[PDB]
Amino acid sequence: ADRFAVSAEAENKVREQQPHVERIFSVGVSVLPKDCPDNPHIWLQLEGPKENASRAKEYLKGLCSPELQDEIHYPPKLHCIFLGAQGFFLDCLAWSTSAHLVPRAPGSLMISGLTEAFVMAQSRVEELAERLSWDFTGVLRDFSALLQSPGDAHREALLQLPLAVQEELLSLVQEA
């Protein structure tokens, strides 16, 4: 009950995203050798804790047949969230939602996955973008503590984010 099947013609996408799934979800993903090369499907095998494997499966299924797909737009000063801190906040959003998330030109993020994974990631980005225009404790203190990666080119843009955005990012990282 550890293995699940996806369409055989998605093997490319799976093999390309393998390192990125293993890194974000701390699992091992293996493409089992298929029993007949004309099979319409291939079997994938996941290794690791139960929670990770479950989220990694949602991610892999959403990668192989996305039910929803769209580019989400937002003010470019938010873009540093998705590139900064060596991808940490993007990684947490992928772990939180199992959506496939790909930054584009500053101001834009490609979101795809299963229906609920997509909707959950899109709603979260809209909340962060919404909080850009709010007006407001040691939130700056706890937020700075997340920025522990060396040589972060985006460290300045992150720290000039409004407190409302920083606090919401703290909520994201400090979740299930």
Side-chain angles (χ1 to χ4, degrees):
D2 222 344
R3 60 200 272 286
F4 67 95
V6 309
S7 158
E9 75 179 11
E11 194 167 324
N12 285 329
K13 269 153 268 260
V14 174
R15 266 174 207 304
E16 156 184 10
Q17 303 296 332
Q18 215 170 263
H20 157 261
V21 174
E22 285 168 344
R23 185 182 58 87
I24 277 150
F25 297 98
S26 29
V27 306
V29 26
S30 28
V31 187
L32 300 187
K34 65 230 201 84
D35 321 77
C36 172
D38 315 297
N39 274 25
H41 63 299
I42 66 189
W43 289 98
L44 309 173
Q45 177 71 262
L46 291 187
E47 288 250 19
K50 206 220 156 273
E51 188 58 22
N52 307 54
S54 160
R55 309 187 167 213
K57 191 207 291 157
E58 240 192 284
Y59 182 95
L60 283 171
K61 294 197 145 143
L63 191 82
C64 301
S65 91
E67 298 154 353
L68 292 179
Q69 198 155 18
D70 209 359
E71 208 177 9
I72 317 288
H73 301 284
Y74 49 77
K77 41 168 136 53
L78 209 78
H79 202 69
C80 57
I81 297 168
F82 309 112
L83 303 180
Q86 275 182 353
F88 172 67
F89 295 109
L90 195 62
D91 292 353
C92 295
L93 185 51
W95 165 267
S96 187
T97 63
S98 297
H100 182 58
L101 308 164
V102 176
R104 293 255 271 235
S108 150
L109 180 71
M110 305 286 323
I111 309 199
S112 83
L114 301 186
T115 301
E116 295 195 38
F118 178 96
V119 173
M120 196 186 155
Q122 163 176 240
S123 84
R124 200 86 201 237
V125 168
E126 258 142 23
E127 177 77 21
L128 284 163
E130 155 85 25
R131 291 167 93 104
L132 263 169
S133 63
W134 294 7
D135 190 48
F136 283 180
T137 58
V139 153
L140 191 58
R141 158 179 220 157
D142 314 347
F143 180 71
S144 291
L146 303 161
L147 315 179
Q148 81 219 14
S149 66
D152 190 9
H154 313 278
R155 192 214 177 63
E156 223 41 62
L158 290 174
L159 293 173
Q160 301 151 176
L161 290 163
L163 276 150
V165 175
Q166 291 168 350
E167 185 168 70
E168 177 71 12
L169 288 169
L170 263 162
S171 300
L172 160 63
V173 310
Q174 283 167 346
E175 259 156 27

